[PDB]
Amino acid sequence: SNQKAVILDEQAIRRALTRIAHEMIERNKGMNNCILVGIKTRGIYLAKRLAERIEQIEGNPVTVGEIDITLYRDDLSKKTSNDEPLVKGADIPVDITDQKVILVDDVLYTGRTVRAGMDALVDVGRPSSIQLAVLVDRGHRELPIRADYIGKNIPTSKSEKVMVQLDEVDQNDLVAIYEN
Amino acid sequence: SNQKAVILDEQAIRRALTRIAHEMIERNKGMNNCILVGIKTRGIYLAKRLAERIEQIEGNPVTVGEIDITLYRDDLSKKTSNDEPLVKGADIPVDITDQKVILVDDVLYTGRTVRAGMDALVDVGRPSSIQLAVLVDRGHRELPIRADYIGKNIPTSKSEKVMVQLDEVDQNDLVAIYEN
């Protein structure tokens, strides 16, 4: 059992998202004229949970969009994690120009997925600003990107992988770190 | 005289660049296989100064590239600062793929110029990472960008402008803050 450790149990996930929701409301005037955009399949589901939490706290709906991204690599190396983002498409159901957008990512690692998400946003509109909310920050950035909202920060080596499980995809809520 | 204040005199500029040069060498194995790329006219001149400082400390030359960017705005508002970057072109004289690149900016403000600089880099190659060095960070980010190396951090309001003067452009070395 010693090559996996739980870094967020289901309670901690709920608590972290609830805290992020409150931080969004405090920093962004109750989230009027602010849109959440998920990246990664699990980032999308997290953005939808966050929108529902903000609606319950504030009483007004929050719009959610999605950016569909797959990460590839240029070589045959299985150890190194996928680090070249391909934007498959995007669906943001309202105009973002002059609005605040918050990108929602499950795990902040190299920053490359975020960079492609910002590019996809500025391709469809001219938001007044883009912020970044992440469930876990595991360090090892390869770009000059930082999150505005963080569920939990953990130290990691490059030999490790962080796995997020969500009910919607995986039929359970958990975050764990694994040795590769 | 009370609508301008000097935040870096010529001594402080020299000292800040010398400190950034040492920090680059400590963090990046003496800057072998690391390229500096300036953005903004003054960011280019700063990158060339930094390269010369690293050469003097380490003894090996450092390659400098340039990205040519002009900032525009979509409206007639003179108060708000220019916030839409147009990449006019780039000249990076070596391949950047699998190399470390450091972008050099004079003043970090919204982050939008940096975002266009990263995009221009990933359009011509696949660097192993991109870092960011700035002479001054004046806050008020509009994107989730942070510098890796900072000469000086200052608090500012949106009513203020930061002016960098360099010998190469302005015939003097100074940084000041002004009330708009």
Curated annotation (Swiss-Prot), chains A, B:
<dbReference type="GO" id="GO:0003723">
    <property type="term" value="F:RNA binding"/>
</dbReference>
<feature type="binding site">
    <location>
        <position position="138"/>
    </location>
    <ligand>
        <name>substrate</name>
    </ligand>
</feature>
<keyword id="KW-0805">Transcription regulation</keyword>
<keyword id="KW-0694">RNA-binding</keyword>
<feature type="binding site">
    <location>
        <position position="162"/>
    </location>
    <ligand>
        <name>substrate</name>
    </ligand>
</feature>
<dbReference type="InterPro" id="IPR000836">
    <property type="entry name" value="PRibTrfase_dom"/>
</dbReference>
<dbReference type="InterPro" id="IPR029057">
    <property type="entry name" value="PRTase-like"/>
</dbReference>
<dbReference type="GO" id="GO:0006353">
    <property type="term" value="P:DNA-templated transcription termination"/>
</dbReference>
<comment type="function">
    <text>Regulates transcriptional attenuation of the pyrimidine nucleotide (pyr) operon by binding in a uridine-dependent manner to specific sites on pyr mRNA. This disrupts an antiterminator hairpin in the RNA and favors formation of a downstream transcription terminator, leading to a reduced expression of downstream genes.</text>
</comment>
<keyword id="KW-0804">Transcription</keyword>
<feature type="binding site">
    <location>
        <begin position="41"/>
        <end position="42"/>
    </location>
    <ligand>
        <name>substrate</name>
    </ligand>
</feature>
<keyword id="KW-0808">Transferase</keyword>
<comment type="function">
    <text>Also displays a weak uracil phosphoribosyltransferase activity which is not physiologically significant.</text>
</comment>
<dbReference type="GO" id="GO:0004845">
    <property type="term" value="F:uracil phosphoribosyltransferase activity"/>
</dbReference>
<feature type="short sequence motif" description="PRPP-binding">
    <location>
        <begin position="101"/>
        <end position="113"/>
    </location>
</feature>
<dbReference type="InterPro" id="IPR050137">
    <property type="entry name" value="PyrR_bifunctional"/>
</dbReference>
<protein>
    <recommendedName>
        <fullName>Bifunctional protein PyrR</fullName>
        <ecNumber>2.4.2.9</ecNumber>
    </recommendedName>
</protein>
<keyword id="KW-0806">Transcription termination</keyword>
<feature type="binding site">
    <location>
        <begin position="105"/>
        <end position="113"/>
    </location>
    <ligand>
        <name>substrate</name>
    </ligand>
</feature>
<comment type="subunit">
    <text>Homodimer and homohexamer; in equilibrium.</text>
</comment>
<dbReference type="Pfam" id="PF00156">
    <property type="entry name" value="Pribosyltran"/>
</dbReference>
<dbReference type="InterPro" id="IPR023050">
    <property type="entry name" value="PyrR"/>
</dbReference>
<keyword id="KW-0328">Glycosyltransferase</keyword>
<comment type="similarity">
    <text>Belongs to the purine/pyrimidine phosphoribosyltransferase family. PyrR subfamily.</text>
</comment>
